[PDB]
Amino acid sequence: MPEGTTKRVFKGYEEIHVPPPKKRSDPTDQNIPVTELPEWARIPFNTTKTLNKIQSKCFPTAFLDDGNMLVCAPTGSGKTNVAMLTMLREIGKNRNEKGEIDLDAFKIVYIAPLKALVQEQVGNFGKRLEPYGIKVSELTGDRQLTKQQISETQVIVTTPEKWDVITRKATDISYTNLVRLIIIDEIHLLHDDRGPVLESIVSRTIRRTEQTGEPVRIIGLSATLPNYRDVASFLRVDFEKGLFYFDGSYRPCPLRQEFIGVTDKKAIKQLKTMNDITYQKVLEHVGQNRNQMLIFVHSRKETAKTAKYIRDKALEMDTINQILKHDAGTREVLQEAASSVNNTDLKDLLPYGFGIHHAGMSRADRTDVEDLFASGHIQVLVCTATLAWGVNLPAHTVIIKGTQVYSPEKGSWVELSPQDVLQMLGRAGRPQYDTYGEGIIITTQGEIPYYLSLLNQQLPIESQLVSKLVDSLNAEIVLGNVRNRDEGVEWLGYTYLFVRMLRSPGLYSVGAEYEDDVALEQKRVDLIHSAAMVLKKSNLIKYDEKTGKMQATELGRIASHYYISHESMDTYNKLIHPAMNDVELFRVFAQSGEFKYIPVRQEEKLELAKLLARVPIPVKESIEEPTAKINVLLQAYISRLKLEGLALMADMVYVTQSAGRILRAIFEICLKKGWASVAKLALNMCKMAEKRMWPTMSPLRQYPTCPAEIIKKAERMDVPWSSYFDLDPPRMGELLGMPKAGKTVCALVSKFPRVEIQGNVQPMTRSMLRIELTITPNFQWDVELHGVTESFWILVEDCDGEEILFHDVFILRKDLAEAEENEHTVEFTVPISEPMPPNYFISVISDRWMHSETRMPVSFQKLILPERFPPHTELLDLQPLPVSALKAKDYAALYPNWQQFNKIQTQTFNSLYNTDNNVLVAAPTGSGKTVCAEFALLRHWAKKDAGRAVYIAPFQELVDLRFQDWQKRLSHLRGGKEIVKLTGETTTDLKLLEQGDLILATPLQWDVLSRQWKRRKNVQTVELFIADDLHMLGGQMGYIYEIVVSRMHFIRTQTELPMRIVGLSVSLANARDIGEWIDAKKHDIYNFSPHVRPVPLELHIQSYTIPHFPSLMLAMAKPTYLAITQLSPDQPAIVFVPSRKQTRATARDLLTACLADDDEDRFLHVEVDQIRKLLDHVQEEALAEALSHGVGYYHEALSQSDKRIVKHLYNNGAIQVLIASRDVCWELDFTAHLVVVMGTQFFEGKEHRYIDYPLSEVLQMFGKALQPSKDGRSRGVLMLPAVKREYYKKFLNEALPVESHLHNFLPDAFVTEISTKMIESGEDAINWATFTYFYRRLLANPSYYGLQDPTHDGLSQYLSDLVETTLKQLSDARIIEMDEDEGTVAPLNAAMIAAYYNISYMTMEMFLLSLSHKSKLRTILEIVTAATEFESIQTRRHEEGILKRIYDHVPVKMNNPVWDSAHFKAFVLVQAHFSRMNLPIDLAKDQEVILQKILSLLSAIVDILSSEGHLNALNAMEMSQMVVQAMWDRDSPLKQIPNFTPEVVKVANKYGINDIFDFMEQMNPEENPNYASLVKDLGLTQAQLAQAANFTNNKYPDITLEFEPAYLKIHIEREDPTVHAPFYPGKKSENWWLVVGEESTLAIKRVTVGKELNVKLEGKHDLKLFLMSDSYVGVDQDPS
C-alpha cells in the first residue's frame, strides 16, 4: 500500500517517485519547552535551544516514569535525546542533594548493532556526560580481563553479541547486577538473523527481574515498521504510557524517495545500466542542482570502480566542467592539500571533486574526506556502509548504487538488510540547510516491492529465534536460569518468538493441534523438550525425559562460553582424539557447521589451487570440495597471502573471525578431557590465528610497534629466541647486526611475558603428592600491550606428556607483579602410582602470547613415599554394653534416656573405665567420642585423691561448649567437684587450677601455666590429661597444642608420679605415631574406620569451573536451593560459606531464589506473627529480614544475643536453613540433616591468594549432618572447584592424615622454652625435640619435612642442622645469647617479654625499628600496628574505598601508605577508635580483634625501650591510656566522662573548665552560682549526671603520692572494683608504673596498686620520678 503516486516506465529502468508527507505538525500542539529542567540535567543539552517535537510525548514518560518504553521514529529524528532523558532520570534516581552519588551504585548499558554507532556514542555520550564524574567506555578487547576492567566504569555501550557473551559466561555477575537501565538502539534488528542474539538478552533480563523483583529499566528504539506493538509487548511496555509511533511527517528533514528498478534481464549489462543511471543522476544533482551527493556501495573496492567510472564517463561526453566548482578558492584546497597529504593513493584522483571512503583507509584520511565534504569541497562521495553508521555527515541526495551484497554466512549473494538502507537514507537531507532530501535507490525490477514496502512501513518484523533455539536454550541452562522443562517454557514466554506465535500462528507453522491450550503452554513444552533432546544426544546437556530436570554439562558450557553451534560441538567431541596432529586438527576446523553454506566455485578453482600449493600444513583430507577450501583459507590467513579474489576475501574473512572462538573451544575441550599433547597444540593454533603468525616466524611479529625491517632481518637469521633475552641495548644490536635497533628490540624483549618457576614436593601418602609451585615474574610491564593483567595456564604432565594431572589458570596482577616481593605461590595435589615414574612436568604458558612457556621437570628419583597405612581396628560386632556396666546408680544416672552404649563406646569401654593406661580413640565426628573421655573421668573420680584432671580442646569456642555441658551434669558427683575453665591471664587461672578438680583449658592457656612446672607444683599433681580434637595439632595454632601435649609427657617422665593421657580424634591415617607419641600400647589405640558413623553420610560432590570468586558464590546459590528443597525438603539443612560477609550475601541469594519459585517464606514453618516478637530484638537488620522469611545466618561478627535467637528458631523448627560462615564451624552447636558446603576456598590478605579449606574443617562441617531420614542416613553436598574434586573426595572417603608443622615454627617455640631456661644448649634442643610428634614422623614421612637419610644417622643431623638454623634465626633477630663455642645459649632480656605477652618473634625482631632514643608517639603508632598478629585480619573487596575516607580524617599519616595492607587497616582503624569514628559492622568486627591484641602489644614495647637507656617508653604509657579511653595524646580529659558530646566539651570549656579535676570541685550548688545556668547549657538528663558523679570518685584515682647504687622509698594511698571504660571489650584494673629519669641527658617499676602500698626503687644529680597508669588519662604525677 504505497502512497507513492508516480510510476514512469523507461527503456531500462522503472522510476517510482513518492512525495514526502508534509502536513502532520498541527494536529496537536506538541511544542516542548526550553531545555529548562531540574537544573542538574541541563548540562548535556548545550547546543539545543528547545526540545524537538519528537521528545515532547517522550519526556513525561522518559523522565518521570519507570515503565519500559518503545519509540519508533525515523533515523535522524533525534531518538538519542529521548534515550538521554531516560539516562538523566537514572542519575536522578541515584542522586544526592549535592548530587553525584557513588559512581559504583548504578551502571547503564547501550546496545547498538554495529561497532561504528557505538564508537561515536562513547564520543557523544562521553563528552556530554564528562561534566559529571561519569565515564563512558566502549566494550572492546577479547581479553577476558579487558572486558573486566572496562566494566569498572559507569556507562558502557556495546554490540548485542558482545554483551550476550558477557552474561553467558557470567564472569562479571557482580557488576551486571548494578545495571538498572539498558537502551537497545535499532531493535528492529529482531528481523535480522542476529535477532535471536537480542531475544536472548531481553528475555533473561526481563525474566529474572519479573522473578527476583530487582527492576531493570529497558528502552527500545526502533524504526517505523509494522507490528511494532509486538516488540512493544515483548519489551513489556504499557501502551497507555510508554508507546510512541510517528509517521514520516516527523523527520527533521523531509525525505523524497526515488525508486529505480532496472530491467530484470540479469547480467553485467544490468550493472552497466546501473552505472549509467548513476552518471546521469550525477549531472542532474551536482552539475545542475548545486548539490553534493554521496553514493553508497557495498564493496570496499566497488567504491573505487564507481568513482573512477563516473569521472571517466564524464571525461567523455565533455561533462566534467559541469560538476566542478571553477573558483580558485576550492581549487587550491582540494588539489594541493588532498592529493599530496594523504597516503591512500587511489583517491589521488579526487581533485575532480570526487571522493572515496571505506574502512580500508587511513583513519586520518577518512577524517579528511569527512572534513572536506563538510566545507563543500568534494561533491560526489562513493562510500561503504561504514559511515552511514556513526558519523553525522548528511548530504542533499544519496544513492544506494546496487542492492545485493555477498554474505559469506550464506555463501551466496543476498539483498540488503533493512537496517542498512534506513541508516543510509537517514544521511539524506541536511536539516537546517536543505528544504528536503532526495533518497534514491537502484535495484532489480523483481526486488522493487521489497524496498518500496520497507520505506512505507510495510516490512514486517519477525522472530528468527527458531534458527538459534537449541543454542540459546543451552545458554540459559548453563547459567542455571533453566533447570527443568517448566523453567524453559517460562523462559520462552519472554522471547520475541513467543509473542509472535500468538499472532497469526499459521505464519510460524504452529500446528492446529494447539487450539485448546491457553497461552501456548503445551507448545512451549513440546518446544523445550524437542530442543533439549537435541542437547542430550550431543552430550551438551543432562536431560531426564520424565522428571523434566535438565542440568548443563561441561561440554555445553564450552559451547555457551564460545558461541559454538550445538551442531559443531557434536562433531568436536566425536572427531578429537588424543593422538591428533596439526593436519588432523585443521580438518576438525573445516568440519565446523558455521561454514556449511560456503561452497567451492569453478571461478575461484584456479586461485584455490594456487593457495593449496603454498599453505604449509598438508590438506590430505579432501580434494577441491568445501571442507578443503575452508581449510586452505585458514592457512592462507596465517601465511598472510594476498588474495586477488573478492569472493574468497569475503569467505576467508568469515572463516577467520570465527576461527578465534572455534580454536579456543577445541582447546578447552582437550583440556577437560585431559589430553596434554593435543591441548598444548590447540592453544598454539589459537595464537597462530589471533597473532596471524606461524610458530616458525619471528616472535617479534607480536609487537605492533616493531618495524618490519627488524622482523625481515630477524627472519633471515638463525639465532634462537632464547638468545634474545637478558641483553642490554649494546649487545642486542650486536646479535642482530642492526646497532640502530639495539635499544628498540631490547625494550621489546624486555616486555615479553616471561616467568621463572620453582616447585617443592611434599608427599601426603603413597598415592598423592602436595606440590607448592612458586612463580616469579621476570619481565617489564607495559599497560599498552599487557593491560592491567596477564593470563597464564599451568599444566602438569606425565613423563610421557600424555595425561594432564593438573590444569588451572594463573593470573598476574600489575600491582602485585611489579612489587618488591613478587613471588606468587600456588598449591595443588597430584596423584602418583607406587611404581613411581621418573619425573612429572610443569609448564606455565601464556594464554595469548606465543613462544612464552617456562617448563619445569619434577624429579622423583630423590622422593621417599610415606610408610603404608595399617588397617583400621576392627569394628567388633559386640553385645551393646548396658548403662549398668558402670557399677553405680549415679554414674548410670548421667545417661537417663539411655539403655545401651554405642558400638564404639562398648568396644573402648574396657581400656577406658577399667584401666589407667594411656588410650587413643579415633572415630569420625559425631560418633560420641565425648563420652569416651567421660569414662576416664568416671573411673578417675571413683578414686581417693583429688586428682586434678585437665581437659583441652583446640579452640576456646570448644572449651566453652564443653564447660557448659560438664558444669551442669558433672558437678553433683561424689561430693563437691569444681569444674573450671581457664581465662588467659595467668595470675587468676592458676588459682583456678588449685581450686578446681577438672580444669578446662586451650593449648595456649595451659602452656603459660605448665611452662613453670618445676615452680608450680599443681602442674605435676595432675593425674588425668584429656586431649580432645587432638588431630588439630596440624591446624591453626596447632604447634602449641603439639608442645603442651609433648611437655606433659616430659612432666610425667621427669616426675615419677603416674599421669594418664587419653586422646580424642577423628579417623586418622597414621595412628601409630600419635598413639606412640601418647605412650598408649598397641591394644590401647582404637582407630576406627571413617565409615563408622551411627548415621551413614550420603555425600554428593558438585564441581564448578568458574575462576571468579563472587561469581562462583552466586552461581552456587541456586544448586544450594535445589540441594535443600530436594534432598532435605522437610528437615533442617546447614549451608556453610567461606566469608562472614558472604553469609548475608548468600542469604538473600537463597531467598531471591525462593520467590523466584513463586514460594517466598519457603523455609518458614511458623506463622510470622509468632516470630514478630523476635524480629524486633534482632540486632543485624539483614538477619531480621532473612529470619522474617525463614532463613537465618550465623557468623563471628554476630552478637551473642542474635546468635541465641538463631539457635532458638533453628532448634524449635521455626526456620529450616542456617547459613553459617566457616569460622563458627566449631562454635556451631547446631545439627542438621543436610550439610551443603558452598565452595572450599577463602581469601587471605597476607598470601594475596585464595586458600583451600583444611581437611579438618570439611570434616567438622559435615559432622553436623546427624539427623537421619526414614532410611536412617544423613546427606551432604560438597560444591568445590573442579580442580579440588579428587582431593576432597579422597580425604573424605579415606582417613585423615596428620603431619606436624612445629618444624616451621621453632623460632616462636624456642622463645617460650628458652625464657624458662628449660632449653639452654644445642643438645638441650635435640633432647627436647624428641618428645614431640614431628620427631616421630621424620622416619615415617621424611620427604614431607626435608629429610634425605631415613636412618638414625640422618635423623640426628636434620635435627642439628635445624636447631642450628633456628638458634641462628634467634641470634640474627638479636633475641638470644652466644653460640658456637659452648653448645649453651641463653635468652636475652627482650626474649622474656616476648613470651610474657606471647608476641611472635618476627614482630619482636622488627620492634628494633623503634631503636631511636625518645622515639615519637606517632612513631610507635605505626610500629605497633605493623605486627604479625594483625596480618590475620580478613580483607574484603569493596572496603578499600572506605579505608581511604577514614585515613584522611585522621591526624597521623604514614609514609608510603599501602592500600591493600592489613597493616594499614590496623593503622587506620586504631585511629578511627581514638576519634570514636563510626564504622560498618564488618569493619567494626575487625576493630575489636585489633583492640584485643594491642594492649598486650603496647605493654610490650614499654618494657622493650625501658630495657635500653632510651626514655621514649613514656609516650607508650600515654598511648596505652589513649587506647583504653579512646582519646588522643592531646585531648580534653573531660571526654572520658560518659555522654560528653564534643559540643558539650566546648560549652564546658567556655565555662572555664580545663580538666575534670578543677571541674568536679568547681560544679556544686554551693560555690559556683553558674550551676543552675550550666545545666540548661550542657543539656544532660538527670540520669547521665549520676553516671558522671559515680565515674569521678570510683573510676578516677584521687589520692596523690609523697616520696622520701641509688635507693628510693615511695608512699602511696587511695580513697577499686574494676576499670570501667565502655569503649573496650575486656578490661583490667589500673596498673601504675614508676620510672626514674631526667629530661635533658632509667630504673622502671611496675606493680598494681591498692590501698596504701609501699614500694622501693632507684657527680651530683636531682632526678625526677614518674607515676603513670595504663587505663585512665590525666593523672600523671612527676616531682623532681
Side-chain angles (χ1 to χ4, degrees), residues 760-766 768-772 827 829 862-867 1033-1035 1042 1070 1255 1287 1291 1297-1305 1333-1334 1337-1348 1350 1358:
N760 179 29
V761 178
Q762 282 189 333
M764 297 176 285
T765 326
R766 293 183 154 254
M768 195 155 280
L769 317 174
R770 162 169 288 173
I771 285 83
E772 173 172 281
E827 290 180 304
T829 56
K862 306 173 187 178
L863 189 61
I864 304 179
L865 305 169
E867 259 293 79
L1033 65 92
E1042 182 178 355
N1070 41 252
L1255 293 167
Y1287 174 68
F1291 298 124
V1298 172
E1299 299 275 350
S1300 174
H1301 52 270
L1302 179 59
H1303 60 287
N1304 291 323
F1305 284 80
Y1333 175 69
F1334 120 86
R1337 213 79 239 279
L1338 287 182
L1339 260 61
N1341 191 340
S1343 298
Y1344 178 91
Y1345 292 91
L1347 186 57
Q1348 291 178 319
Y1358 173 74

Side-chain angles (χ1 to χ4, degrees), residues 876-1155:
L876 271 66
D877 194 334
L878 304 178
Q879 187 178 341
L881 183 96
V883 293
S884 61
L886 305 89
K887 302 308 175 56
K889 292 292 203 306
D890 62 333
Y891 280 5
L894 308 181
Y895 317 92
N897 29 28
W898 284 26
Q899 283 190 356
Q900 298 166 125
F901 278 96
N902 196 31
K903 197 74 66 178
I904 302 166
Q905 310 164 355
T906 72
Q907 183 166 334
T908 48
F909 170 77
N910 204 269
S911 298
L912 281 157
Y913 188 72
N914 310 322
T915 310
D916 287 323
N917 295 344
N918 309 309
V919 58
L920 173 58
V921 35
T925 35
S927 297
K929 310 182 295 295
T930 153
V931 306
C932 291
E934 298 185 2
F935 288 168
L937 288 165
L938 294 180
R939 147 158 272 258
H940 173 78
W941 278 337
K943 220 217 295 180
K944 32 154 306 185
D945 332 55
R948 275 163 198 133
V950 172
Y951 170 94
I952 287 184
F955 311 112
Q956 183 75 36
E957 339 132 24
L958 296 176
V959 316
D960 292 4
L961 271 64
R962 193 70 274 156
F963 179 96
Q964 181 265 359
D965 189 77
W966 275 350
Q967 218 256 354
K968 294 185 178 181
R969 273 169 53 247
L970 305 192
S971 280
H972 63 295
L973 220 52
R974 277 83 196 282
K977 298 312 170 189
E978 277 286 333
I979 304 95
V980 307
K981 64 166 180 175
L982 298 196
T983 168
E985 47 173 342
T986 68
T987 181
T988 60
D989 63 355
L990 58 77
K991 58 184 182 183
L992 292 173
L993 174 60
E994 193 174 15
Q995 197 204 11
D997 305 320
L998 174 54
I999 293 87
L1000 305 204
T1002 64
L1004 178 66
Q1005 285 179 343
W1006 183 260
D1007 180 26
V1008 296
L1009 287 191
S1010 66
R1011 284 167 180 175
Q1012 43 178 202
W1013 60 278
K1014 305 183 175 182
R1015 180 185 300 177
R1016 312 292 170 182
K1017 309 298 181 303
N1018 285 326
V1019 180
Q1020 305 93 307
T1021 321
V1022 310
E1023 299 158 8
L1024 184 55
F1025 184 73
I1026 309 187
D1028 198 343
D1029 295 304
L1030 179 59
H1031 66 284
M1032 297 299 308
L1033 65 92
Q1036 179 189 12
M1037 305 287 98
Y1039 69 104
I1040 58 181
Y1041 198 4
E1042 182 178 355
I1043 298 167
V1044 286
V1045 179
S1046 302
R1047 181 183 303 157
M1048 295 300 295
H1049 178 69
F1050 186 75
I1051 261 58
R1052 64 171 182 173
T1053 205
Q1054 299 303 124
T1055 310
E1056 295 285 343
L1057 62 82
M1059 198 195 81
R1060 182 197 199 187
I1061 313 179
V1062 310
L1064 312 174
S1065 176
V1066 290
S1067 301
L1068 303 166
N1070 41 252
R1072 186 186 313 283
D1073 295 316
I1074 301 191
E1076 292 177 354
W1077 176 55
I1078 218 58
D1079 197 22
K1081 198 39 205 163
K1082 181 197 302 178
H1083 58 281
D1084 281 323
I1085 298 169
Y1086 305 88
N1087 185 26
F1088 291 99
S1089 172
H1091 301 334
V1092 183
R1093 301 184 196 264
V1095 46
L1097 181 61
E1098 191 179 89
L1099 188 77
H1100 309 68
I1101 294 189
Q1102 306 177 356
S1103 35
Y1104 292 69
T1105 52
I1106 296 178
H1108 199 231
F1109 187 80
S1111 286
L1112 183 49
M1113 245 55 51
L1114 179 48
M1116 288 187 307
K1118 182 166 191 184
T1120 304
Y1121 173 83
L1122 291 170
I1124 301 176
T1125 51
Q1126 298 176 331
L1127 291 170
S1128 171
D1130 289 71
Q1131 298 188 243
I1134 290 184
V1135 180
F1136 278 104
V1137 156
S1139 178
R1140 69 152 178 266
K1141 174 162 286 183
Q1142 241 297 318
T1143 56
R1144 316 128 167 182
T1146 201
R1148 275 298 209 183
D1149 284 350
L1150 199 78
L1151 220 65
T1152 56
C1154 283
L1155 44 77

Side-chain angles (χ1 to χ4, degrees), residues 1185-1399:
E1185 176 81 23
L1187 285 167
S1188 77
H1189 303 288
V1191 171
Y1193 61 77
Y1194 196 121
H1195 54 71
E1196 56 277 36
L1198 229 47
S1199 88
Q1200 291 306 127
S1201 187
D1202 280 353
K1203 297 177 176 178
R1204 286 188 275 105
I1205 296 183
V1206 184
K1207 191 184 178 187
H1208 182 47
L1209 276 85
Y1210 185 94
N1211 295 342
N1212 274 85
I1215 68 173
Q1216 181 178 3
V1217 182
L1218 172 64
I1219 294 184
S1221 78
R1222 68 137 207 158
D1223 321 47
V1224 298
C1225 60
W1226 309 100
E1227 165 185 321
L1228 216 66
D1229 197 17
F1230 292 74
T1231 304
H1233 165 266
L1234 165 67
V1235 179
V1236 314
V1237 180
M1238 286 211 208
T1240 59
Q1241 302 153 324
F1242 69 91
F1243 189 89
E1244 257 305 278
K1246 183 190 299 193
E1247 291 289 78
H1248 258 289
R1249 72 194 195 92
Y1250 286 89
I1251 305 177
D1252 280 307
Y1253 281 177
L1255 293 167
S1256 342
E1257 294 199 336
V1258 182
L1259 289 162
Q1260 173 67 201
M1261 290 184 302
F1262 281 130
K1264 297 171 171 49
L1266 307 171
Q1267 300 193 17
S1269 306
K1270 289 202 176 190
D1271 53 2
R1273 56 171 49 186
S1274 73
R1275 331 210 189 283
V1277 333
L1278 180 65
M1279 305 169 182
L1280 37 69
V1283 153
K1284 308 304 174 178
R1285 178 193 158 95
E1286 298 297 329
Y1287 174 68
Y1288 293 87
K1289 188 173 92 169
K1290 173 179 202 59
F1291 298 124
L1292 288 175
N1293 244 86
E1294 285 183 321
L1296 161 70
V1298 172
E1299 299 275 350
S1300 174
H1301 52 270
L1302 179 59
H1303 60 287
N1304 291 323
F1305 284 80
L1306 298 186
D1308 268 328
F1310 286 169
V1311 165
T1312 81
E1313 288 285 359
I1314 303 179
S1315 72
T1316 54
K1317 290 304 297 171
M1318 179 178 158
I1319 168 188
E1320 314 175 18
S1321 39
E1323 268 64 25
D1324 262 66
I1326 301 186
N1327 150 264
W1328 174 89
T1330 54
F1331 287 80
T1332 193
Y1333 175 69
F1334 120 86
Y1335 180 76
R1336 292 185 163 274
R1337 213 79 239 279
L1338 287 182
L1339 260 61
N1341 191 340
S1343 298
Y1344 178 91
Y1345 292 91
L1347 186 57
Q1348 291 178 319
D1349 286 67
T1351 67
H1352 294 75
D1353 292 330
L1355 170 59
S1356 53
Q1357 310 160 216
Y1358 173 74
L1359 259 73
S1360 68
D1361 290 338
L1362 179 51
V1363 301
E1364 185 71 44
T1365 307
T1366 303
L1367 259 51
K1368 215 277 293 291
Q1369 293 173 210
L1370 288 129
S1371 183
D1372 290 359
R1374 298 175 188 173
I1375 207 65
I1376 220 176
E1377 201 70 338
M1378 305 300 301
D1379 267 69
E1380 248 308 283
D1381 289 25
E1382 309 285 282
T1384 67
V1385 52
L1388 187 72
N1389 54 265
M1392 311 291 195
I1393 47 95
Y1396 184 17
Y1397 313 97
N1398 268 319
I1399 303 187

